[PDB]
Design a protein around this ligand. Sequence first.
Ligand SMILES: Nc1ncnc2c1ncn2[C@@H]1O[C@H](COP(=O)(O)OP(=O)(O)OP(=O)(O)O)[C@@H](O)[C@H]1O
Ligand SMILES: Nc1ncnc2c1ncn2[C@@H]1O[C@H](COP(=O)(O)OP(=O)(O)O)[C@@H](O)[C@H]1O
Ligand SMILES: [Mg+2]
Ligand SMILES: [Mg+2]
Lengths: 539, 523
Amino acid sequence: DAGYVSQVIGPVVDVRFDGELPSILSSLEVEGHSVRLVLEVAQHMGDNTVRCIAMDSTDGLVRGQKVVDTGSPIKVPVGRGTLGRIMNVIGEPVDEQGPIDAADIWSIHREAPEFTEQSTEQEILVTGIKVVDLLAPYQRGGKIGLFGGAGVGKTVLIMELINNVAKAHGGFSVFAGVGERTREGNDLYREMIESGVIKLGAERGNSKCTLVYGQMNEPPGARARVALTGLTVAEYFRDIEGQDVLLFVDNIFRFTQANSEVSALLGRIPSAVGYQPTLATDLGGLQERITTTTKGSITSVQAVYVPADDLTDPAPATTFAHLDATTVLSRSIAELGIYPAVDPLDSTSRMLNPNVIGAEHYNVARGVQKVLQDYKNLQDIIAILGMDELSEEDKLTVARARKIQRFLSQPFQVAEVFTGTPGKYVDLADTISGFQGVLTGKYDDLPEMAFYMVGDIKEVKEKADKMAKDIASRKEADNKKVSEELKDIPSLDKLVSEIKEVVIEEDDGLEEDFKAEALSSETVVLNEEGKSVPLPKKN
Amino acid sequence: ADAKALDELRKPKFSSKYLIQHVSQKLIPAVKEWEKSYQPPVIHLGRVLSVGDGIARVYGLKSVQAGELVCFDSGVKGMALNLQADHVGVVVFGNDSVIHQGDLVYRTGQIVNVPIGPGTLGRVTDGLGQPIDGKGPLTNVRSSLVEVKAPGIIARQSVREPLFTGVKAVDALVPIGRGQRELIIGDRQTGKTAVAIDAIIHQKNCNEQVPKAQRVYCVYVAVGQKRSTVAQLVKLFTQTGAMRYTIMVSATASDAAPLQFLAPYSGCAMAEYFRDTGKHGLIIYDDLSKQSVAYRQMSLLLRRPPGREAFPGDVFYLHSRLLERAAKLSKELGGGSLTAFPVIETQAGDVSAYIATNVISITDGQIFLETELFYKGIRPALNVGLSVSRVGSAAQFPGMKQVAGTLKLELAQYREVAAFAQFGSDLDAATQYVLERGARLTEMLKQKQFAPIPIERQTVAVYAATKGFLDKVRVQDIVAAEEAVISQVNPAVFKILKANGKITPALDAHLKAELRKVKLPGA
Ligand SMILES: Nc1ncnc2c1ncn2[C@@H]1O[C@H](COP(=O)(O)OP(=O)(O)OP(=O)(O)O)[C@@H](O)[C@H]1O
Ligand SMILES: Nc1ncnc2c1ncn2[C@@H]1O[C@H](COP(=O)(O)OP(=O)(O)O)[C@@H](O)[C@H]1O
Ligand SMILES: [Mg+2]
Ligand SMILES: [Mg+2]
């Protein structure tokens, strides 16, 4: 009826069944474990043995421990009952608010939608970010990849995409945290209580986002399947509810990385750089499920971590074919202080087409990429010469491209807690006309760094007002300033006297609650009967 | 050869009995003739099949758990890592020269655990909790597992308390938080441990100043280091008094590979006592690049298939499940914290190494230490263009946040013109003025070793450089100029700046008044 544990090597368990082996991708429960241990069948080993990957840690597993078959893959709750909840890889609530009251629990394993049920319409999803909406515009119902290394701003960019798009969307969103920090999974949860996307208690059903989290502390079996758990919630809102879904997947790279951590233990010889041999079909099996069908729509935004800023690594290079839009974040843009650190050339979208976005949006986008590529080819000779002999045709294409690099930067609403300046939402028609003036030459009247960290073209034009007031300051240095004491400044001895007395109890708080148990100097083992005995005095 | 007719062979089909009737009365006198060489059969105990290179393959041990402490009959401990169908692969916690083929292995019943509590506070232990300082066994202590899972989303809160390190290159540019995991990465002998020792020394100066609950209890984990370097470091912590709040776990280079692999988890479980009881911890995993080499040795000798640079496939999970245990807990869990400083050594500055890029993606911030900035006099050799922090604001001093914002900004203008300093044109007084002030800001961040600075004395020294009061000082004697700024400025301006937290405009007047009353010796 049931099986037993045959072999535990790391996170990979071999389970032997005396007849009626479970199917591949089916879920198995381990009986008698400390926590709920769920094994997903990866392959059939051949001598009535299946090979599995565990969804929790395999510490405590005994050879011969009873393993029951659920007769089905990992089924998770889906529906309106999961909105405003944090889910596990196996559908457990990890937000400590009751059980998940969702009906019609769904398998996390299905095949991709067919070729006939594919939509071909291309409508622009306006973001509010003037490097996104100009140079590589996103598509509602399309697949967005935020590439970039560690620390270049993928999570801040995907947080600005949440409060701009997923708040004013109307439909439901799903965040799938795949192999990330639990700190920023808590920061996402807490600032969606405050913004109202997640509501708690009796108004739980008015929430608009389902959280599915598979963070870095989880074993590689849970990290490799949590991207299917959050996709199953997004596929229920697309198919059964018929809604438009926003699927945010933070670091889909961790899906491919977690399958690599079990690949040699599943008995596969390695491919190129160190990934599994099934790198393009495991990733392609996931990405083709995230599509816009004729029933509903899924607009997916995926952060893709590139290892060591290398876009030629095969795990981000496989993801490029699955994406309609592509936002490559660069470290060279970030080191100049320009945020969001989007490479204006390396970013590409399917919507950058004059038959889709119009020939006026398209030509100012290609005009910005023309002057920015010309600046990249001129910076070779500027460091050798100095940019003083270029006869003011190549000095104009430097001065305009340097204004454009600053004007591609933007203050973010989610980044004002570590920068200070409030974020700006720029409309689509307000950044096409703003980049037309810098391109045709309307705004050479303005200084170059006035374009830095602003919103509309009417904010750089008023930052040049403030920048030329404040350099017309610092002219008076004599008196009538704050440094004279007789105005409202107390003496430095009197200012010390308003310090409130703080106490020190000098005991460091260690003798108040600790259960100081006794630890045996002898070693204590188990005999053949299982009884606890001291170690026998014989070597 | 199919199993249908092979399990049909379980049914008897002998059709004759001229051996079954003969040898049944002949077997027991034949077994009893050679029973001197028969070892007794083993079911729930173990017996060593093969031992070598710190790995014992153990027959028997029917009911052992995975990751369980086992004990050989010679007294040395082990750990059942891969439980296979016919044997158990045991990593040996010590020297495997005392283990023979045929030794009895004893299951201890417990998953691997270390002593945690206030009794470890002040001791030097090995990678399993046994004290090596020669001060007797651990009293006032209790046992806890080394493989506790990290606190989840609902258990944490946002990182808001500072935990200053005393290094003003750190505390102004790359501000640490109270539950933040910050990597200290660099080449060999670039000052990696120095930045981490100055953090531990600075907590002893702050623990005698704060009311009993903002006190930070340090844990230093010395993986793979030599034993005389560790003894050189307890001598520094005892003569400073930092050893009152410091635990030291030291699985040195002579220890076994599963002891250096387990010492970051052994030290984190000792530091998790303070996080889980409302106190604040600070753990330094010095040479976390040496734990991955020790873990690679076990897995290659357990015959697990190698990967990138022959590392195991799950070597990301080796460090991700370790560092995610460093968190800031919620108010319902005590409000305690644990901040981690892992140390990774790179080879010739190659940040693109395999273990290096894993811990960069796990930890919040990075402290990059370059060997070419180290020899230009910049000590600590902090690469400002490469060292980032995830928290930014709301995790540093509010007084420092006013004066270090115009330092991170103005040092970016210094680096953007250093690639334009070979010509010497220095047009329109712009690329030359920031080259004079940006050179005066890198000399501000230079400081000594084993002498950390309080944050009120750091936010005054960088107050005096981003603002005026140092504009006509040569770039050769700014390091001595702050001794005028720290000592000759009236020291009650530090007490009111420590108690306020920010630079009030009533104090911005006195900080501009008393910085003109000092005579700097630069001439
Ligand atoms: N701020 C500093 N001022 C002066 N010397 C310093 C400073 N920081 C570190 N050093 C010196 O630099 C050398 C290397 O420092 P440290 O031991 O921290 O380096 P490391 O990267 O840990 O080296 P190793 O790879 O040998 O462990 C030592 O001689 C140390 O005293
Ligand atoms: N939009 C932004 N505006 C300002 N600073 C940013 C922005 N994005 C990132 N940063 C800075 O760079 C760091 C990298 O951001 P993060 O999203 O954590 O990057 P990644 O996920 O690629 O590691 C942040 O901690 C912050 O200091
Ligand atoms: Mg991230
Ligand atoms: Mg060192």
